[PDB]
Amino acid sequence: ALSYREAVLRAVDRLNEQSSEANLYRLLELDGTPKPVSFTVKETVCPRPTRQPPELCDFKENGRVKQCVGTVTLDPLDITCNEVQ
Numbered sequence: 543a544l545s546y547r548e549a550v551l552r553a554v555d556r557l558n559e560q561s562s563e564a565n566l567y568r569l570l571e572l573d574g575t576p577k578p579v580s581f582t583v584k585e586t587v588c589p590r591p592t593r594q595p596p597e598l599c600d601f602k603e604n605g606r607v608k609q610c611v612g613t614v615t616l617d618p619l620d621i622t623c624n625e626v627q
Contacts, residue, residue: 550569550572570601582626
């Protein structure tokens with residue numbers, strides 16, 4: 543469970559690392575073999591090149607919200623996030 547939650551936060555970090563957007567996204571809601579994941583992330587006030595954990599970054603109001611899905615290994619990134627329509 544805990545390792546699970548941590549792998550999701552870790553994924554959020556990777557999405558931010560691979561991102562091309564201006565700001566860091568932060569976890570909004572969390573809904574051996576890789577485990578399925580489904581969670582939403584939301585845009586924060588912190589600009590992408592910032593060595594600040596996203597959880598210390600306030601959400602941007604009216605900031606973009608995305609739904610991410612895929613998998614995580616409790617020990618490559620396999621999640622794709624699409625803006626919520």
